[PDB]
Amino acid sequence: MENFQKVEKIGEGTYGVVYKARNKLTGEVVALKKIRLDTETEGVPSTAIREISLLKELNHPNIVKLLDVIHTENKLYLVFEFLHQDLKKFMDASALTGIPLPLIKSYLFQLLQGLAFCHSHRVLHRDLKPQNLLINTEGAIKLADFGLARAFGVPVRTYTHEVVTLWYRAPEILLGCKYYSTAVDIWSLGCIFAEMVTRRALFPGDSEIDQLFRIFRTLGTPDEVVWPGVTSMPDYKPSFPKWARQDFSKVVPPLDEDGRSLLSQMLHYDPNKRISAKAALAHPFFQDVTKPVPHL
Amino acid sequence: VPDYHEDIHTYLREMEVKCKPKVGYMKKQPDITNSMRAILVDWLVEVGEEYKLQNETLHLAVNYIDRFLSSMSVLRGKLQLVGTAAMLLASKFEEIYPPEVAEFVYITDDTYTKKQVLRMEHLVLKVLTFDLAAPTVNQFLTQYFLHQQPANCKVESLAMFLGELSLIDADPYLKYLPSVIAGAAFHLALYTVTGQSWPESLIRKTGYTLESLKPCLMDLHQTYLKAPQHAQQSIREKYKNSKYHGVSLLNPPETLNL
Numbered sequence: 115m116e117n118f119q120k121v122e123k124i125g126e127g128t129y130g131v132v133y134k135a136r137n138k139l140t141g142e143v144v145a146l147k148k149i150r151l152d153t154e155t156e157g158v159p160s161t162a163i164r165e166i167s168l169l170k171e172l173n174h175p176n177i178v179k180l181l182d183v184i185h186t187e188n189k190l191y192l193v194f195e196f197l198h199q200d201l202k203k204f205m206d207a208s209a210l211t212g213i214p215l216p217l218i219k220s221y222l223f224q225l226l227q228g229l230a231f232c233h234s235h236r237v238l239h240r241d242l243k244p245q246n247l248l249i250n251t252e253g254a255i256k257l258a259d260f261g262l263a264r265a266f267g268v269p270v271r272t273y274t275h276e277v278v279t280l281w282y283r284a285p286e287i288l289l290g291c292k293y294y295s296t297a298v299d300i301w302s303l304g305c306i307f308a309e310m311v312t313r314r315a316l317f318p319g320d321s322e323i324d325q326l327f328r329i330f331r332t333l334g335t336p337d338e339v340v341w342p343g344v345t346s347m348p349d350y351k352p353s354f355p356k357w358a359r360q361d362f363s364k365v366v367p368p369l370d371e372d373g374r375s376l377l378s379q380m381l382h383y384d385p386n387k388r389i390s391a392k393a394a395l396a397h398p399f400f401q402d403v404t405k406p407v408p409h410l
Numbered sequence: 411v412p413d414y415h416e417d418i419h420t421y422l423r424e425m426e427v428k429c430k431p432k433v434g435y436m437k438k439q440p441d442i443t444n445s446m447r448a449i450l451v452d453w454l455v456e457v458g459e460e461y462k463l464q465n466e467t468l469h470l471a472v473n474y475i476d477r478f479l480s481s482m483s484v485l486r487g488k489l490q491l492v493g494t495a496a497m498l499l500a501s502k503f504e505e506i507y508p509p510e511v512a513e514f515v516y517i518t519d520d521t522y523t524k525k526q527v528l529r530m531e532h533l534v535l536k537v538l539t540f541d542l543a544a545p546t547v548n549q550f551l552t553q554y555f556l557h558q559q560p561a562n563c564k565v566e567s568l569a570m571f572l573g574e575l576s577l578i579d580a581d582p583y584l585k586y587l588p589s590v591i592a593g594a595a596f597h598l599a600l601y602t603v604t605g606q607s608w609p610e611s612l613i614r615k616t617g618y619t620l621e622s623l624k625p626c627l628m629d630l631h632q633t634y635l636k637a638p639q640h641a642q643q644s645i646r647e648k649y650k651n652s653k654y655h656g657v658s659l660l661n662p663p664e665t666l667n668l
């Protein structure tokens with residue numbers, strides 16, 4: 115820790131606290147993530163064990179690069195590349211100007227890039243949301259914060275129920291399914307893709323049932339036709355109001371036809387029909403995709 | 411019904427060659443032996459039962475122990491401290507509810523202190539350089555079952571029983587890749603229960619024939635016949651139970667006709 119000049123605190127977590135730093139020798143600006151170990155009780159937190167070990171195996175342009183771990187007995191720091199700001203702060207900068215469509219198309223292509231890498235290396239992220247998404251001045255976007263991620267198996271075997279932020283949590287977790295795979299990161303990305311377009315959050319519920327009804331009002335309440343099996347999921351209740359599906363030009367007004375189609379396949383109720391990241395890549399939406407800078 | 415079925419399988423194949431422990435690290439350990447390793451692994455099985463940990467957790471702890479022992483020399487008195495901390499880590503990596511540290515200290519019977527286990531966890535993390543996401547027999551077995559029609563969970567428990575027996579006996583099993591032992595085991599499980607064989611679909615997916623599995627199949631078959639005679643009986647005790655359909659109690663077949 116001698117080589118680092120901490121420059122400013124940039125935020126939070128729960129086990130951990132984030133900083134901007136520089137090497138006093140190479141000049142490199144990094145991000146330092148501090149976690150407290152308190153050196154007596156529990157040892158190394160498992161979010162950290164998870165994060166570090168998964169990240170080691172996920173080097174890809176669209177995913178924060180882990181640079182270093184420093185294991186000072188009772189604090190643990192992680193050294194990441196420093197990207198310039200997260201997607202939420204960006205969204206707040208521009209929610210009045212709009213985010214240009216070319217940039218959106220580009221950020222999404224790149225999240226589909228790095229997310230498909232994960233899913234091919236049996237990692238689920240499980241906490242996509244713009245505060246976890248980082249952007250750099252040259253046009254790049256990278257998935258970050260892997261504390262809540264986990265290596266999965268084929269087929270899956272019942273991971274943590276208590277999972278994904280809320281506004282981003284797929285109906286199958288909301289409804290208390292026993293299994294859930296790579297579709298949960300997709301749902302989140304849909305919400306993401308939508309939130310960039312309209313600049314409001316797609317589904318801002320305040321409880322789990324609120325969350326559900328907001329999904330239902332927007333995408334129509336699901337049945338055995340559109341999602342075989344719903345009627346018998348643990349948290350399903352036949353007393354759910356029956357709403358109809360809105361029209362997406364109404365839900366995401368600024369979005370062209372190829373887009374709404376993809377967002378739509380991203381938001382399919384059936385996790386088995388929900389488009390994977392790899393197929394999402396070869397979608398018409400992506401005929402001619404560029405790499406714009408953020409003009410802010 | 412994955413979407414990344416093939417990608418994951420390929421990645422796990424690349425990965426298992428890199429996470430391999432070295433075959434003969436035991437020949438270079440002054441104070442410990444396969445025999446001592448076996449008491450430790452079998453004890454781990456028992457801990458797994460008591461705290462109802464996933465079989466994967468057990469496979470990862472054995473991975474981290476074999477790897478750790480390939481770089482470091484340890485004394486017999488400290489061997490169990492390496493096992494504990496390996497299991498604590500596999501717990502943190504793999505479990506929804508990993509046991510607390512103090513509960514680990516409890517199951518060593520206070521052989522070591524809280525602070526010894528913590529410090530060992532640090533060391534293991536250093537030597538393993540944090541590379542904890544290992545492929546295991548388990549991970550291959552679950553993939554291979556997907557090729558079984560109509561399904562049959564007697565074949566499935568027996569294959570897990572056989573793959574777990576492989577963890578006790580460094581000799582010979584370290585000579586084999588997890589995908590090979592899982593192949594062998596699965597074939598053995600199929601054959602014992604329904605008389606069928608390694609399906610041609612798995613020949614395709616894995617590139618292994620019965621010919622290339624034969625070496626490991628021999629050994630596994632022996633191990634399985636001599637099971638009741640073994641010095642360690644935890645895995646057999648575990649699999650008598652009605653959870654795993656009582657597979658440790660099926661009569662092995664006497665010949666494999668190859």
Ligand SMILES: CNS(=O)(=O)c1ccc(-c2ccc(/C=C3\SC(=N)NC3=O)o2)cc1
Binds near residue numbers: 245
């Ligand atoms: C909220 N403040 S900010 O948007 O200006 C901002 C946030 C984060 C970072 C930054 C650089 C590197 C990281 C790494 C992170 S953040 C996180 N939750 N997990 C990480 O690994 O985070 C830079 C600026």
